[PDB]
Amino acid sequence: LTELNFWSERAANLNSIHEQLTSEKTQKVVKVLELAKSTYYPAFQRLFREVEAAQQEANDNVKFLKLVDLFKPIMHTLMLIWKHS
């Protein structure tokens, strides 16, 4: 299941890096660097903007995603998933 595991991994990894970047020592590093205020810090601002929306949207679709003769009614579930999603 490449798609399901792909987006689950994306949500987990990006949340983990998102509090690798919002944690305490990183915050002190950003302010100690902000005793210089030259150029780089708007670039990390925009890259944090890259982080947050992808993080939350990955979380949303992870919460959404949660013999075959006997298992055609399961296909109704599939249409209903496409119906519901």
Binding site: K63, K66, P73, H76, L80
Partner: peptide, 17 residues
Amino acid sequence: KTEEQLKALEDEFFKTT
């Protein structure tokens, strides 16, 4: 010579709201 499956899947989608 399957109504209850519909309703329950609606319920589980509403649990994921």
